[PDB]
Symmetry: D3
Subunit: 232 residues, 6 copies
């Protein structure tokens, strides 16, 4: 690995991955005896314990290309179970800010990364691990958190998401938009990793405002449910 310079043995088999380095640092305060095992290229990785289990929290940056590199290197250091915890923009009006979306599949446009890894443009089913996803639903229900289960569209161009865009994807059965799930699910299917994803709704493209104190609380509550699942 040339991006994540963590020593083997410093990365856990169970990893909670987030796009924002700031979130990784904030969430590391939920672990027992957290240690920073990497900061190279801004990809902060922390390792500690939770519920009698060793767990790491890693930063993946923005986009498929970035998360693909991070996952490949974490896997080379020992990781094989990944739960992405990010933020997303809702594509339907009934979902409120601060609520959660447990992902069951990812839509995506063919090309680049997918062509290079798959060798052709076939539409491979981009889905998370069945069991791990059901465990997430169980954990979020236990903590009485408001969630929705559905597919999301993994976009590669944040600034090309206009109004035509929103009705198009919502009409295709997607309830939110983000940028890394399709890459995570497909690469995991190919590499044999167990992955899942939970997202915090930070905006609604179909429809409200969220402070930041209510948002930080949302992030924190969801993180605890994710860690519960990872260490089950």
């Amino acid at each position: 690995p040339v991006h994540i310079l963590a020593k083997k043995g410093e990365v856990a088999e169970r990893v909670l991955v987030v796009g924002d380095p700031g979130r990784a640092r904030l969430l590391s305060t939920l672990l027992q005896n957290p240690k920073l095992t990497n900061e190279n290229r801004g990809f902060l990785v922390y390792t500690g314990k939770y519920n009698g289990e060793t767990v790491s929290i890693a930063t993946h940056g923005i986009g498929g290309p970035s998360i693909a590199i991070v996952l490949e290197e974490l896997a080379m250091l020992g990781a094989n179970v990944f739960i992405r915890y990010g933020t997303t923009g809702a594509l339907v009006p009934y979902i409120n800010l601060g609520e959660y979306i447990i992902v069951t599949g990812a839509s995506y446009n063919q090309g680049g990364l997918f062509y290079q890894y798959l060798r052709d443009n076939a539409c491979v089913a981009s889905t998370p691990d069945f069991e791990l996803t059901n465990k997430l639903v169980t954990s979020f229900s236990k903590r009485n958190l408001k969630y929705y289960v559905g597919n999301v569209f993994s976009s590669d161009a944040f600034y090309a998401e206009d109004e035509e865009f929103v009705k198009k994807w919502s009409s295709r059965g997607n309830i939110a938009v983000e940028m890394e799930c399709a890459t995570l699910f497909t690469l995991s299917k190919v590499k044999g990793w167990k992955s899942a994803t939970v997202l915090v709704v930070s905006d609604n493209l179909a429809k409200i405002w969220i402070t930041k104190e209510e948002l930080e609380k949302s992030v924190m509550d969801g993180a605890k449910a994710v860690l519960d699942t990872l260490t089950s």
Copy 2:
């Protein structure tokens, strides 16, 4: 109005078990209370009756995405909105035995044709079944103590273009079996607002040509599984 499924108003139930083979539609109809044949046009047999006191239908969809799309579209026009496909499949991994079941979590497919016509472009839309309904099937099958696996399948359009290279390609991509209608079922359902799921009976194993099963043992498997599916549709 429908031009293939010639049924009248109120004859088609909201919940439907769809199968590809008309022979299987007829055989499974014997599991219902007072089965009535509501359609036979173009060979697409459809039966309507009761199971556990609930009204339900069993419909034939023929082979391939173009065929099942027409049948789903017309059944929906007749009032159907919940579909559980119950078919057969060829396993793509060595550890799955004949007669066992696969509860589908998603479908891989090659772009083009039907999808381009419905989606208007070549984006890879997530082709997945209804989350809740799929979990209900898992519960139902484990209750009847039936051996099943949960995973993705590849929905092929060319039965006779499935060679060895084919098997390693799709199995390496997270698919554990191959059939021909799930991708169309799931995608059209997501776009139309229908609730769908799929359970398949393993009738062959492309990764293990040495194993075989008789129609007696297979028919037995089909029957046991049909009960589990019907329990779910009427839950």
Copy 3:
């Protein structure tokens, strides 16, 4: 060993008239001498008999390219090598009336899974019928004084996505009708070495007849096709 068409080898003729509707296969079998039902599996009815001093079979192919591909492949494994599809179609031009016929000279299609799986890439391989066989059809229909038009058709994969925008698009591309199996039939036949053709009965005009007038049209056309198959 075929898993859809369970007819015993020798029970399928080298010459086959294929139709999508099982009901039509049953009805047309009455045009053969000493007709025998050689297959019923999966609803794919297949009858074999004689006509004009030759053995001939009438087979059901179902709806769509994936369905007809399977049927053609298995009939061929059983000895068939000449296929003439007889179906129904919706005209894309206003001057063609219901009940008239269309002898197909080529098929337009959208790039898709079936063609990619068989061709291995996205090349637009010419999807055309056998030239000689197609001319024989023209001769047979002309002999029976039947009104027909020759031209290309679009083989759609999605019946319920054919809107008005659809009609202008394909008619401006040189197609005079729409159906769902010709492209698959023609392309597979060229790759496999089979001799194939197609005649269609216009049952609807998307740009502009009693069940008794239609039924007569179907029957009259079937006779022309059988004459061709045994010419």
Copy 4:
């Protein structure tokens, strides 16, 4: 006004025999009665004269789809509506001999720029000749006792990329020869409403005397002219 074919309106016939080589256009013009050179701009030689009671033109189209598309479009703007391409080709099957003829029934092609610009998407529109006109060609060649074969051809865009793997791929796809302009001719004609067809002279066999070739080219040209005026 057309910017490549500078012929005056009336100087181009409704019936046109099109060839890729300007040298062939010139040579074949001697088969016409009272031939007149109506254009030479950009090297696209066009002659117009008479044959069997009808006015007929012989036009040069250059090499490749982009070139023939431009020539056909401008000839049409000048009054042409029936086109028969007469070219040379390389057989893809060993049983066809040099100097023999191939009457084209369809053209295979790779999806590409020209087709996308004209069709607006990647659909594989049937690239076929006019059925009636093609049958007339068969009749003319048969009457002159010439040896021909009917079949599909692959319209290649890259002459120098046709390796051995190439021969196997296209021959197994139902094509009996390779050339470069038929797909463009057929598809554009179907969209524009023109009546077109093609006859080819086999100048090489990729699977297996110039005095005999000249004879073959001339004999075929007469059969094509008979067809255009039939």
Copy 5:
């Protein structure tokens, strides 16, 4: 070679390539003791001297498939440096007829020729030789000629270039449209040839209200040819 029938040593290493054979013959008058080395299939090729340097002027016809054949055969005959000198239609209103465009890259729709040569649909960078292109800039500025530097769209369908077409390509950074540059640049990068292109603006699709006469245009072609030949013999 089966199209360009020249013998060993008759084709120069440096070649000025043009689409119109009429232009090839006309420009040959700028050479010392020009000799016609080929006329087969209409592809006129002349070889002579400029500034005491041996060079050739060759015809390539219209379109990617045509220029590919010509370049491949000229290269088989010994050519390795190509400078295309043709005509083009501007896609922006501020460019006047008779002015010049020095090409920095070519946009194109995938398929056909590119798929056959590249074996897939990757968008390979279609650009000219860096050094040669800068030589042309120096030469044109030296002869005080008005020119613009930018990318062009290499179209395959002349009669499918409507107005929507103009806004689409101009919004993508292309200032003109022609039909051979993408093929020239890509094939050169793959084959190892040194190539570049200068185009004379003969029309403006963004401004249909401007025109030029064959007199003023011929003068434009001539002046530009001198600058190109100066570069080819530098």
Copy 6:
């Protein structure tokens, strides 16, 4: 902007963009009175002066999607001139570690990002600003730095770059591989920004360097880039 939380006026019109946050911090020491104007999501942005001009040094992360977001937001805050200074893997054996590559174009695989922005799969010419690129060549020559001018392939999958890969792209006129140039150039053409790129060779995929020799290389090239940006 929701990623780069800097106020308009804190981002310069001239920007030197790098992928590594650490490089941005290191290179900021070359500016006069550097100020950190953003750190959100890890995208460090510094703004200071150099040769009488105001300039910013911004972090863009890894990949097309990431740099596209950063460029769009920097532009919304006033930026219109961008010079990417990154690292790259050489695809040809004659280029040594620590040497530089001035980019003249970028090859790429269609799909995703490009389809969303361009609305189709056309291969738009992904090239830098002609003038700005020539200014870079002049600056590197002046500082007697060893450089090569050529095209690069912008890959989206770092871990799919095998041996077959190297020969393929090298045979297509590309002398190095990186991941952001195609996005930078194409988006710049569409948005009307002036962009260019210089890369430090950190690996050679066709054919070693410590780190001190490398840091020296990065530093020397950064000064040449800043000279170009402020000319």
